[PDB]
Amino acid sequence: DLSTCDDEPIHIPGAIQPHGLLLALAADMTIVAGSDNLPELTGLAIGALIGRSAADVFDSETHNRLTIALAEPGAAVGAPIAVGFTMPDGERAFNGSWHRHDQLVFLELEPPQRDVRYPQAFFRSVRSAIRRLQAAETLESACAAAAQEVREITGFDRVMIYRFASDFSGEVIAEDRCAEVESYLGLHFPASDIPAQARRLYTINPVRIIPDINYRPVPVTPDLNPRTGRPIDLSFAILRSVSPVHLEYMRNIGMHGTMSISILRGERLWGLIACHHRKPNYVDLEVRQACELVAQVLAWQIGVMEEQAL
Amino acid sequence: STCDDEPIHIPGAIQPHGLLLALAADMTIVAGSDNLPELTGLAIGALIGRSAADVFDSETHNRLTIALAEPGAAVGAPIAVGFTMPDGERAFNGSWHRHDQLVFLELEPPQRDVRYPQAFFRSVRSAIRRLQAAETLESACAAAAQEVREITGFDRVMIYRFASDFSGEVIAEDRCAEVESYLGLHFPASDIPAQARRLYTINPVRIIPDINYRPVPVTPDLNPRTGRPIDLSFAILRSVSPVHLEYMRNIGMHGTMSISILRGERLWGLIACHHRKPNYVDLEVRQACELVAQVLAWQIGVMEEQAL
Numbered sequence: 001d002l003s004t005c006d007d008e009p010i011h012i013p014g015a016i017q018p019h020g021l022l023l024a025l026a027a028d029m030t031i032v033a034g035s036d037n038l039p040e041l042t043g044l045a046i047g048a049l050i051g052r053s054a055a056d057v058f059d060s061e062t063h064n065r066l067t068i069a070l071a072e073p074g075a076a077v078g079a080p081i082a083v084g085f086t087m088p089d090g091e092r093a094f095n096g097s098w099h100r101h102d103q104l105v106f107l108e109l110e111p112p113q114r115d116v117r118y119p120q121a122f123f124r125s126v127r128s129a130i131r132r133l134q135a136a137e138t139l140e141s142a143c144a145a146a147a148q149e150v151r152e153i154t155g156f157d158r159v160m161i162y163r164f165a166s167d168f169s170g171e172v173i174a175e176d177r178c179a180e181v182e183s184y185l186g187l188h189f190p191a192s193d194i195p196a197q198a199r200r201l202y203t204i205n206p207v208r209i210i211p212d213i214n215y216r217p218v219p220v221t222p223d224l225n226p227r228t229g230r231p232i233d234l235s236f237a238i239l240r241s242v243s244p245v246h247l248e249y250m251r252n253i254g255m256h257g258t259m260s261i262s263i264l265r266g267e268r269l270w271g272l273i274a275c276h277h278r279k280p281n282y283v284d285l286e287v288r289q290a291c292e293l294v295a296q297v298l299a300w301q302i303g304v305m306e307e308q309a310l
Numbered sequence: 311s312t313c314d315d316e317p318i319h320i321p322g323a324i325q326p327h328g329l330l331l332a333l334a335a336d337m338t339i340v341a342g343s344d345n346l347p348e349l350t351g352l353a354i355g356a357l358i359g360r361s362a363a364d365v366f367d368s369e370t371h372n373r374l375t376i377a378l379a380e381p382g383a384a385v386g387a388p389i390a391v392g393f394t395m396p397d398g399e400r401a402f403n404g405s406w407h408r409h410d411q412l413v414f415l416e417l418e419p420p421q422r423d424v425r426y427p428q429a430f431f432r433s434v435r436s437a438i439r440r441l442q443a444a445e446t447l448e449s450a451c452a453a454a455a456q457e458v459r460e461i462t463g464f465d466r467v468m469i470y471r472f473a474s475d476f477s478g479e480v481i482a483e484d485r486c487a488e489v490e491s492y493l494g495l496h497f498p499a500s501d502i503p504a505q506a507r508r509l510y511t512i513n514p515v516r517i518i519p520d521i522n523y524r525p526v527p528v529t530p531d532l533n534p535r536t537g538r539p540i541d542l543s544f545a546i547l548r549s550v551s552p553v554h555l556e557y558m559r560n561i562g563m564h565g566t567m568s569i570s571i572l573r574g575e576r577l578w579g580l581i582a583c584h585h586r587k588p589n590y591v592d593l594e595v596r597q598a599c600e601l602v603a604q605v606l607a608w609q610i611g612v613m614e615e616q617a618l
């Protein structure tokens with residue numbers, strides 16, 4: 001008390017965070033469910049899109065891009081996709097990401113933030129970040145370089161490299177932060193801070209962001225997968241509404257924006273790049289992707305160093 | 311030292327798929343490519359001595375001043391460019407670099423395509439996974455060649471490793487069934503002479519989308535600081551040795567791109583890409599190919615086996 005930790009079904013909250021929209025599609029692209037904010041940011045209104053083809057809802061270019069993406073052999077758990085609608089109004093572009101799960105195709109839409117951000121310049125800077133990281137030659141220094149790069153690209157107040165021990169307790173082994181915030185370097189945390197069902201989720205889905213912990217959830221309606229007759233599994237949805245217990249925990253330490261990226265050493269959860277901001281901090285899909293690439297390169301380095309000996 | 315002698319860094323010309331402008335440190339226009347009127351409606355004659363502010367829009371001028379002002383590294387970076395002009399305004403995909411006391415801008419008209427080229431992140435994520443699963447140098451190079459071919463669509467992608475005498479061997483390859491294999495062939499050092507090699511050690515990417523291009527003169531071809539021809543070593547548009555052009559014409563490949571594989575300071579090898587037809591490589595693509603080369607070189611280093 002609390003020892004009910006592992007029991008919360010965090011993957012089926014029936015709701016998302018309000019900063020994007022979510023549509024759930026059948027394989028033939030009929031809309032089966034949608035976030036209740038679909039009228040505002042866009043159409044009008046769920047009961048109105050339900051049963052319509054997503055293809056009569058978005059762009060001709062978007063439908064083509066999605067058909068290409070979904071035909072691409074080798075699963076992948078989805079990817080970015082540029083999305084546009086034209087409506088009675090009414091022409092909007094979104095940063096989309098799709099994914100397949102639970103026998104549905106999900107489309108999440110985020111309005112493009114930060115306001116350019118020339119992508120060619122951003123790719124070049126990502127390459128340079130990767131170069132600095134790959135030049136580190138010890139575990140702490142690779143971890144510190146990783147935290148510095150992520151901090152640089154995301155502007156987060158405090159970026160921490162959290163390493164799991166064999167019992168899933170953990171320690172902050174590297175950190176880059178603004179001098180105004182507290183250091184967590186060297187601090188140890190028990191396993192129950194990230195309970196077993198979260199660790200499972202974070203092994204299969206390596207990126208999460210909660211830009212404002214004080215958000216009001218938006219329901220997904222109907223919250224019923226027609227393929228299962230049960231609530232829709234939002235495990236792979238970037239917009240998934242998270243456990244209220246975690247949000248209380250964040251409020252408790254005074255950080256209203258958070259993101260973390262799993263560091264996967266093979267198929268195993270080695271640690272996290274954990275990021276805290278004092279106020280809300282929205283991070284574009286492109287920047288989240290750069291942070292994922294950083295964790296991927298860092299994981300590879302960690303493995304090479306682990307194979308050293310002997 | 312005979313194939314060594316061609317002054318490849320000073321051709322006084324570029325390839326016609328972009329334009330080049332050269333600016334003094336105070337941003338006045340020093341020189342530009344003769345296709346300015348065709349691509350922009352403005353003449354070089356009307357541009358020499360004029361300020362960058364007086365020529366590009368304010369947002370471009372800002373981006374560029376900020377990029378150049380950034381302290382520390384970078385020979386250069388990508389930049390989005392628009393022109394001020396009475397006839398209106400045109401957007402270009404830009405890079406700048408600094409070299410020989412000049413600042414260069416290279417600009418290409420924006421991509422217009424019926425096709426859907428692949429995305430930087432997905433392509434790099436997938437390439438690292440594959441490289442990482444590899445357990446030998448040869449398999450790591452083959453994964454690199456296969457990823458670069460997938461990203462680019464090139465008919466043949468080869469990993470060319472230099473020996474200590476700077477001869478070379480194609481140690482991995484991916485190709486379409488329609489073109490011959492070069493896998494396991496050795497080539498003499500003369501195929502990439504000493505001055506090209508030195509260039510390719512400091513400037514790691516080269517692209518010749520159409521080897522039968524009509525070179526476009528840079529005017530004036532005279533650096534005001536230096537009284538010598540404009541040094542285009544870091545220009546991605548530089549017009550390339552016509553000897554190397556004929557070398558490709560002779561093997562029927564009309565589009566090429568290569569990326570250096572660098573091991574610290576040493577030119578270790580090339581990712582060499584051949585296409586039968588001209589091949590204009592998407593800008594996101596060339597960056598992904600560059601990152602593949604950097605991660606491969608790291609991996610080659612690891613397999614070399616530690617910390618000096």
Ligand SMILES: *C/C=C1/C(=C/c2[nH]c(/C=C3[NH+]=C(/C=C4\NC(=O)C(C=C)=C4C)C(C)=C\3CCC(=O)O)c(CCC(=O)O)c2C)NC(=O)[C@H]1C
Nearest residue numbers: 002005010189192193194198242243245246258259260274
């Ligand atoms: C009994 C329930 C508890 C609990 C539940 C819980 N916690 C999470 C998710 C996270 N917990 C995190 C822990 C840390 N962040 C840090 O910075 C550090 C130390 C440096 C630790 C130990 C992290 C990073 C997450 C991921 C989310 C994020 O990045 O902010 C969940 C799952 C939330 C969700 O995905 O729905 C749950 C159920 N935490 C507890 O302390 C006890 C009371």
Ligand SMILES: *C/C=C1/C(=C/c2[nH]c(/C=C3[NH+]=C(/C=C4\NC(=O)C(C=C)=C4C)C(C)=C\3CCC(=O)O)c(CCC(=O)O)c2C)NC(=O)[C@H]1C
Nearest residue numbers: 313318480497500501502506550551553554566567568582
């Ligand atoms: C005496 C002059 C000769 C000569 C000159 C030359 N060659 C280059 C540049 C390249 N040569 C290349 C060689 C290969 N490409 C391949 O695929 C293979 C086989 C696997 C080989 C040996 C390459 C890759 C380049 C870089 C350009 C590219 O990627 O297409 C230059 C310099 C061109 C320039 O940068 O201006 C010169 C002067 N080559 C000869 O064979 C003799 C006759």
